[PDB]
Coordinates of C-alpha atoms and ligand atoms in Angstrom, one line a residue:
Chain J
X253 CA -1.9 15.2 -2.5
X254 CA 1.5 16.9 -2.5
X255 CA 3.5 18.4 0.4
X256 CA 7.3 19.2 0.2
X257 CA 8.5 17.0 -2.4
X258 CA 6.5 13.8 -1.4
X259 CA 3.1 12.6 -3.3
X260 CA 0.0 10.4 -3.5
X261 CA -2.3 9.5 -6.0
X262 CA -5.1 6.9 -5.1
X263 CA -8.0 6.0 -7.6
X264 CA -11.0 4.1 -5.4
X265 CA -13.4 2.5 -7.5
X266 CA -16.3 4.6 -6.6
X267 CA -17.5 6.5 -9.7
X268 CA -20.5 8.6 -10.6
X269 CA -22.3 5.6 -12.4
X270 CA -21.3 3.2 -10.1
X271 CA -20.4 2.8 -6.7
X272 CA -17.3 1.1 -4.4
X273 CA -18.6 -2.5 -3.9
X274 CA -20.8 -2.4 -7.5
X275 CA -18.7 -5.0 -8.8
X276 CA -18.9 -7.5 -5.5
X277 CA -22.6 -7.0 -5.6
X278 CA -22.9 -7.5 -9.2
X279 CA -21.0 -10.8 -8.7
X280 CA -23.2 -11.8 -5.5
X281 CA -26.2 -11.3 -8.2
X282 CA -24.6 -13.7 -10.6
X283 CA -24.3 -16.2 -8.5
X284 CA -27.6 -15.6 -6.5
X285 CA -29.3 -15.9 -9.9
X286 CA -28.0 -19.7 -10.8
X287 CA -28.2 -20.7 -7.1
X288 CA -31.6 -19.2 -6.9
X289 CA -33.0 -21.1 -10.4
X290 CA -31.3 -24.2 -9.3
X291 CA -32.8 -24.5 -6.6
X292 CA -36.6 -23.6 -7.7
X293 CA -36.3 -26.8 -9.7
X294 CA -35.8 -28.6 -6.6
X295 CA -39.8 -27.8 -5.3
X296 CA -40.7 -26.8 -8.7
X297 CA -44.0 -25.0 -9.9
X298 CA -47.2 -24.2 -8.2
X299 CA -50.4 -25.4 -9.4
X300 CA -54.0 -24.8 -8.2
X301 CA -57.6 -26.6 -9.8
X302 CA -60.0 -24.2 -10.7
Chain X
X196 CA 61.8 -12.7 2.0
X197 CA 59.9 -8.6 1.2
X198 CA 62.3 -7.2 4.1
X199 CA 62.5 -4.3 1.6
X200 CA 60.6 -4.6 -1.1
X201 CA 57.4 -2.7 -2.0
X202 CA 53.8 -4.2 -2.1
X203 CA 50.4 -2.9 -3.4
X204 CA 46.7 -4.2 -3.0
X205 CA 43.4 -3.9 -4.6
X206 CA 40.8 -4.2 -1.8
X207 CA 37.5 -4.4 -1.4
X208 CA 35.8 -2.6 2.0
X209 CA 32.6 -2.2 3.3
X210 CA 30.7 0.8 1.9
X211 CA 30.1 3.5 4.8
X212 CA 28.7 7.0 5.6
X213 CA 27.8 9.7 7.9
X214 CA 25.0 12.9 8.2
X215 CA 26.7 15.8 7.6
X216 CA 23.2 17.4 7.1
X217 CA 19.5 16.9 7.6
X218 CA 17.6 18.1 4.9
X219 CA 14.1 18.6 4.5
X220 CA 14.3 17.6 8.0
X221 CA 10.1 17.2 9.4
X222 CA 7.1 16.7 7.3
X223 CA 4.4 16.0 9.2
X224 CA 0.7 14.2 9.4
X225 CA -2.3 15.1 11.9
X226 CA -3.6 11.2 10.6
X227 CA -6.9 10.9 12.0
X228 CA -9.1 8.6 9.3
X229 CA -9.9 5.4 10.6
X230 CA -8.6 6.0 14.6
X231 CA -10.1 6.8 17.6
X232 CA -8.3 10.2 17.8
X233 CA -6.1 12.5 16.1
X234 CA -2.4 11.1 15.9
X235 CA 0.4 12.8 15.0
X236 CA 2.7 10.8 12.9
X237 CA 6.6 12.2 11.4
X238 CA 7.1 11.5 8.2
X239 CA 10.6 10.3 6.0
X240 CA 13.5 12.8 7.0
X241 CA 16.0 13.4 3.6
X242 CA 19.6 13.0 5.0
X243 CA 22.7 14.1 3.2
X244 CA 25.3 11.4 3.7
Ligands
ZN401 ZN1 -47.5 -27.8 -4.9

């Protein structure tokens, strides 16, 4: 934006492929996935007789 | 002992100045994102000193 000799410019981080937080979820995700798998190990797997 | 004799300095003073105009004088902003109402906010005069 431009009005009488002062200007902005601001670039956000939303895009068409992706969108403004993308890249806190996609780090929530990468840590959710080693905390998740961790932790499985801790009750391990389920079993059943038949 | 200079009853009448000359003397010179070089001196160093304060740098100073005054508006003799106002240029570009209001620019202007009906800012409204992110408030609970319009608000009208003046922008950066542009003096001439
Ligand atoms: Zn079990």
């Amino acid at each position: 934006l431009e009005v009488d000799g002062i200007t902005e410019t601001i670039g956000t981080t939303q895009s068409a492929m992706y969108g403004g937080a993308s890249a806190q979820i996609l780090q929530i995700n990468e840590d959710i996935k080693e905390l998740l798998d961790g932790l499985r190990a801790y009750f391990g797997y389920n079993m059943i007789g038949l | 002992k200079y009853e009448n004799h000359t003397v010179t300095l070089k001196i160093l003073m304060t740098l100073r100045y005054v508006v003799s105009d106002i240029l570009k004088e209001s620019r202007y902003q009906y800012t409204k994102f992110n408030q609970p109402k319009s608000k009208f906010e003046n922008l950066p005069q542009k003096l001439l000193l």
